[PDB]
């Protein structure tokens, strides 16, 4: 298991997300679903010039899986997945500018719900999660597990769990007072409100 420090600006953003009083927490789901849709768009486009990229799975979709026993909500997609370089360096590097812009906008009247306009919506996960675990598999790379409970660091390890094929699974370990996001009717409500026109099947599992 390797431990890494977040870029300072991203640590700052995460602390803001964790510490700011902001009741409209449900927007985390729209942001994660949007990121999944983006990843699905990417593999779809790439498969047009190289159809073998779908040898790891032709189905392009999103599953939402709540688990009350584990207190987790998992957002699964069969998108392009992430390389080790994506996890450690790339996604944090590209998020730098967006983080700065977002934090500046907040000082000038914007609110946290606008976070996706700056390309850093993933971090809204920390509105509801005490810990986020991300399992990911990109073609031509190994399956990885990324994990962070904030506090300025994240880990990455090669994942010896059940093979995914291709895509990304974001596992939200929900805060004690955020268990509403495990309820069928609540998730349905949020998807209908914010994610109605996503261009991929979204299947909400029940318990
Ligand atoms: O399918 C996906 C779904 C996602 O939420 C993400 C994603 N977007 N931003 C980040 C930041 C860190 C990690 Br670890 C995953 N991210 C990336 C892919 Cl590839």
From Swiss-Prot:
Transmembrane segments: none annotated. Residues 1-207 are annotated as: Interaction with NR3C1. Signal peptide: none annotated. The modification N6-acetyllysine is found at residues 42, 68. Disulfide bonds: none annotated. It is found in: Nucleus; Cytoplasm; Melanosome; Cell membrane. ISGylated. ATP binds at residues 35, 77, 96, 122. The TPR repeat-binding motif mediates interaction with TPR repeat-containing proteins like the co-chaperone STUB1. Molecular chaperone that promotes the maturation, structural maintenance and proper regulation of specific target proteins involved for instance in cell cycle control and signal transduction. Undergoes a functional cycle that is linked to its ATPase activity which is essential for its chaperone activity. This cycle probably induces conformational changes in the client proteins, thereby causing their activation. Interacts dynamically with various co-chaperones that modulate its substrate recognition, ATPase cycle and chaperone function. (Microbial infection) Seems to interfere with N.meningitidis NadA-mediated invasion of human cells. Decreasing HSP90 levels increases adhesion and entry of E.coli expressing NadA into human Chang cells; increasing its levels leads to decreased adhesion and invasion. Belongs to the heat shock protein 90 family. This is Heat shock protein HSP 90-alpha. It comes from Homo sapiens. The gene is HSP90AA1.
